[PDB]
Design a protein around this nucleic acid. Structure first.
Lengths: 124, 208, 99, 150, 138
RNA sequence: UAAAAAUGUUCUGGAAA
RNA sequence: CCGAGGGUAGGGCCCGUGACUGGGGCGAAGUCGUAACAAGGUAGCUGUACCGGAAGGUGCGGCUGGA
RNA sequence: CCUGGUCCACCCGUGACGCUGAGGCGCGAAAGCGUGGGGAGCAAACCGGAUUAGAUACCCGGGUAGUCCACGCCCUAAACGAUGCGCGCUAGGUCUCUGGGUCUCCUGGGGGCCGAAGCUAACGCGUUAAGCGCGCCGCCUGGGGAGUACGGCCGCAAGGC
RNA sequence: GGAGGAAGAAGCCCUUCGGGGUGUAAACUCCUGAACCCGGGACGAAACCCCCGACGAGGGGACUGACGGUACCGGGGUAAUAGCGCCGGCCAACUCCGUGCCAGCAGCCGCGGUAAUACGGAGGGCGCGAGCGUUACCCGGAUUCACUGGGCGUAAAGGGCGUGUAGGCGGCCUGGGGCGUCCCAUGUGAAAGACCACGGCUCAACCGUGGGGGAGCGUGGGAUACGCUCAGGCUAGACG
RNA sequence: AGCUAGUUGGUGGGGUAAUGGCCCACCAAGGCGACGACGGGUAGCCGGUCUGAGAGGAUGGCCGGCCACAGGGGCACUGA
């Protein structure tokens, strides 16, 4: 466009949209699972992913994913939302953080334990 | 902290013989002299044309591992080595030679590098009068590095100080063998340091 | 130094006051192009002797009233109803940019 | 003889009644790190075959580079296809600031210090060729003058 | 009605140089001659000369090329490789003496219009003046 | 340029290479 | 005299919510057909208008991105 | 009969009076709407016949708006060269409409095709540029949601922006 | 912790059951001495004030340390923590077993349906280390709002077409003005920060001293090519 | 997308350390707006900070300068 047309209209900044409204960007956000079920994934893949539907301190009720194998969440377990989406679950855009509040670490995990609560076993 | 662990395990892997142990690593068994291959379970099979990245990694590790300098310092010192007016190639290599303990090792005193460090961490080493114990201490021109007195009579300092009779020091250092002194006449040169390292790569590895 | 601006006279239905239209040009802060722009000042006319289409200088002055902070320094040219029409015409069009 | 260094090998396919039938592409760059490089793209039914072939043409598509202390006389922005490449001279010590494809060439040409930037389509082949035109078009104060004599 | 005499002139040169024309005609302007004088001194053209086409004042620029070449396409190398108008009416460009551009590491030239005359980058720099940046040629 | 000629449906999800 | 605030009344902007309702996106293996892609079996697309469970059909004009 | 654009020739007059153009205003195929008029042929809708598993279609027989005129609305399109307006510059060959010529052919304006240089992702474009340049305007920033909703303006409505 | 230390213990893992790996790693030998112990122990504090000289200049005198019995120094002195991520490609790093579109992974492309370098464990490896990963947000990469530095026949993109308001832009010659513009001088541009040089804490991080930038805008002076403005002259655009 | 009654200007007053519609009578009808007035949203500004080849982009916590506020709100007294 003509310089004159830039002088008049000028350019336009992009403005990025957040993939995670956990308000204040808040690295995380606390909440309570009001529904803790298992959804069937998107396509290529088949499975029974375990997802909790949690009510938040942001004033939002979102559905999040419970990473790892085997979890201990019930209809009222307080939980810490982390934000990180799941490709197959059309709805889930956040990950429940293992090892915080009612969320138990992953029993017997031995690799990447840091990413799953699961403390550290004593070589005993 | 400064690795500490299987080192003549890197004489291997980098495939470019290393003497981080000194005496032995200098013998007919640098570990290297029996396995010119990397460790692990595989270690002796066809090797994919290492990526343009890999080469640089290996070049860097070659160097950094060759001092014991832990990355943080290594890469840090590298940056200083950048702004400083001049070729990063010389400079850096030079700033790696200015490492107190290093010079210690560079001027007999200690059989090897890892050993020269401890000598520093115990006082045994001394500079232009007052003593020093920071392996990171950076030597400057006209400064001699002297052993302490409490040591001079130590079984180790002996044998190690003996290996000097006959052998000459690097073209930028002197040495009062009987009076354990020797100065640092000037920052070493690319050629003087005959290192199995291709600095120009180690440099490219920090671009990305 | 008191700021001295040169502009044309558009309007003067005020008592002892005359609105002046000062033009200026400058490089665009990002795109270079030199561009005009304008402002109107309410210069004081105690003598009541300057009128429409009068290119006059305007000097900074101790506040004479709200808005009026300039006095007419000196006439620079008379008769320029041409410059005034442009202004006038621009204000006229506005009456079509409504909803 | 020269250095030789491939930039990329690749496998393409054409179809037939019985399904797809393959073929290989070797884009090889060869030089002496002191003024002479050449690029060549070979095609064959076996990788080995293609890379040898790409090496052959390689020496045939040569080009004198006016190296000057390890760098290029001036700066050029050559476009090829929708692939643009920019070469800007550097000071000693800088090194080669380019991508894999252009570096391979510049490095075998003997260039030691150079600022580079790929713009537009970064297609390997196309950038690679856009780099050779670029090097091919450089001049030195010397041949600029033998141009505007009098 | 032609909106940029100079721009046009630069273009007419470009156009014929690229089709190995012996000379090209361009409408006469005192300011334009200046440019041309510089284009001739720094050696880009063989020379210009006020002439008259159909009763009107024109400038005949004489192009200069390189020697014939080998292989396919023997079309000679070009003396005027590049020639781009910098300051145009749609956006003028003025440069301080410190701000003066260096064209092609030195193997090229920019042409400024200063209060001291239409001079080149070197001439402008030496004279410590700056100005409107007419064009650049390499 | 001017431009005739066929009544008749459908094939679960992944993966092929 | 002015005046924080309070009080009656009526406008404006925005947010939440509402029986029921409109269409939308998404969702391994549901139902009906068969509009389009090869004169895709009535060349296709198109603005409009009427019509039809549904794709869509027909009218009028236009396009070739059809012969 | 009234009237618009436009081109050639003579170079006679004016003497930069120019280009472009947000808004505004005007025009704007077909269908569609409001009065009234008109209505042969054609023909959405609609009713038959036939085809078909079905046939709200294709084919056949009928047929009302409409198509036609006037006045006023509507303001959309594959409104297309899917290519904004103007000016300068950059090989030719050929066919063609219209003007002037010292009517071999030249020269001006227009309509085509092939192609220098150059451009393009390619296809292709190429003095009727999609080439090389300057001026001004419009417009584009991944697909769907959607030219949808809310708001506003417009319209009788349909809807348009 | 350092230096020695096996054609190489055991255990664990692979195996074409010869063997290969973890690995000089350990054990083992000497050697240094983080911690801790005893003794000593700061700088930061020199004037207010007092005395001689006038309560001036100058000289001398006395009080005062929260941090601290800390830093630091002397002597003595024990082998004295290691973890986290990752190893399909991008991207450094591969094998065995388990599972069998399950359980699970996943930043993008995608891994799993009975031989999975992709899930989970192990061995092994790579990276970084008192750290190592994860989430959120900013810039980069993104010439992906393109001033530098992009586009619109078919990929998103020419307005249905005119006329025209504001605006933008404007041919050739000359002269006056000197707003744009360019040049010199000068005022301003605090400090810290940043950069460089050199110094002070054993180094560094911190820290001090010095040095150098700076457009912008004010003031005074000057230039006049180009743009602008007034004026005169022209005819190649345009109109008649 | 239009906004404005202390609204825009005047004269004479009150007021103040002082200019001024800051406030007041009286008079005149003005002022402002697509160069975006009025309105809605968000926000303390800067030195700088992060990023960038650069032009830019993002940001304004510590330290330094200016502003503003002191439970929400109005007002004055003392006084340089």
């Amino acid at each position: 466009p003509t310089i004159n047309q830039l002088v008049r209209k000028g350019r336009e900044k992009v403005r990025k949209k957040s993939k995670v409204p956990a308000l204040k960007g808040a690295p995380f956000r606390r909440g309570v699972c009001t529904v803790v079920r298992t959804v069937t994934p998107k396509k290529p893949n088949s499975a029974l992913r375990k997802v909790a539907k949690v009510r938040l301190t942001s004033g939002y009720e979102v559905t999040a994913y419970i990473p790892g194998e085997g979890h201990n969440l019930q209809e009222h377990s307080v939980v810490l939302i982390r934000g990180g989406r799941v490709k197959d679950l059309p709805g889930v855009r956040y990950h429940i953080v293992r090892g915080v509040y009612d969320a138990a670490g992953v029993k017997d995990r031995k690799k990447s334990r840091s990413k799953y609560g699961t403390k550290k076993p004593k070589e005993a | 902290g400064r690795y500490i662990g299987p080192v003549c395990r890197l004489c291997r892997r980098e495939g470019v013989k290393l003497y981080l142990k000194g005496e032995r690593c200098y013998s007919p068994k640098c570990a290297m002299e029996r396995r010119p291959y990397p460790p692990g379970q595989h270690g002796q099979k066809r090797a994919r044309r290492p990526s343009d990245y890999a080469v640089r990694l290996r070049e860097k590790q070659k160097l950094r591992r060759i001092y014991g300098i832990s990355e943080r310092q290594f890469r840090n010192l590298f940056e200083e080595a950048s702004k400083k007016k001049g070729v990063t190639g010389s400079v850096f290599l030079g700033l790696l030679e200015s490492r107190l303990d290093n010079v210690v090792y560079r001027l007999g005193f200690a059989v090897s590098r890892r050993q020269a460090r401890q000598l520093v961490r115990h006082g045994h080493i001394t500079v232009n009068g007052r003593r020093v114990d920071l392996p990171s201490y950076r030597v400057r021109p006209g400064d001699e590095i002297a052993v302490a007195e409490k040591s001079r009579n130590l079984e180790l300092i002996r044998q190690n100080l003996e290996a000097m009779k006959g052998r000459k020091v690097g073209p930028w250092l002197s040495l009062d063998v009987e009076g354990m002194k020797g100065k640092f006449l000037r920052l070493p040169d690319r050629e003087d340091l005959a290192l199995p390292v291709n600095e120009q790569l180690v440099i490219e590895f920090y671009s990305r | 130094p008191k700021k001295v601006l040169t502009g044309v006279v558009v309007s003067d239905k005020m008592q002892k006051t005359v609105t002046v239209l000062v033009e200026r040009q400058f490089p665009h802060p990002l795109y270079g192009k030199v561009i005009k722009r304008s402002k109107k000042y309410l210069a004081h006319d105690p003598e009541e002797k300057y009128k429409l289409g009068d290119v006059v200088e305007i000097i900074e002055s101790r506040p004479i009233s709200k808005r009026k902070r300039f006095r007419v320094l000196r006439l620079v040219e008379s008769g320029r109803m041409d410059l005034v029409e442009k202004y006038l015409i621009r204000r006229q069009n506005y009456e079509s940019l409504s909803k | 003889d020269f250095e030789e260094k491939m930039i990329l090998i690749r496998r393409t396919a054409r179809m037939q009644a019985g399904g797809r039938r393959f073929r290989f592409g070797a884009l090889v760059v060869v030089g002496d790190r002191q003024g002479r490089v050449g690029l060549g793209f070979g095609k064959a039914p076996e990788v080995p075959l293609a890379v040898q072939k790409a090496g052959y043409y390689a020496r045939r598509n040569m080009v004198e580079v006016p190296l000057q202390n390890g760098t290029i006389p001036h700066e050029i922005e050559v476009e090829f296809g929708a692939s643009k490449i920019v070469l800007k001279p550097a000071a000693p010590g800088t090194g080669v600031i380019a991508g894999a494809v252009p570096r391979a060439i510049l490095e075998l040409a003997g260039v030691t210090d150079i600022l580079t930037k790929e713009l537009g389509s970064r297609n390997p082949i196309n950038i690679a060729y856009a780099t050779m035109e670029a090097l091919r078009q450089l001049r030195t104060k010397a041949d600029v003058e033998r141009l505007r004599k009098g | 009605m032609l909106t940029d005499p100079i721009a046009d002139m630069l273009t007419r040169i470009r156009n014929a140089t690229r089709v190995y024309k012996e000379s090209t005609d361009v409408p006469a302007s005192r300011f334009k001659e200046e440019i041309l004088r510089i284009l001739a001194r720094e050696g880009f053209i063989k020379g210009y000369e006020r002439v008259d086409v159909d009763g009107k004042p024109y400038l005949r620029v004489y192009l200069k090329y390189g020697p014939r070449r080998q292989g396919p396409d023997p079309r000679p190398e070009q003396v005027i490789h590049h020639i781009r108008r910098i300051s145009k009416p749609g956006r003028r460009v003025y440069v301080g003496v410190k701000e003066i551009p260096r064209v092609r590491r030195g193997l090229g030239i920019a042409i400024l219009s200063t209060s001291k005359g239409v001079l080149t980058d070197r001439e402008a720099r030496k004279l410590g003046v700056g100005g409107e940046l007419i064009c650049e040629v390499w």
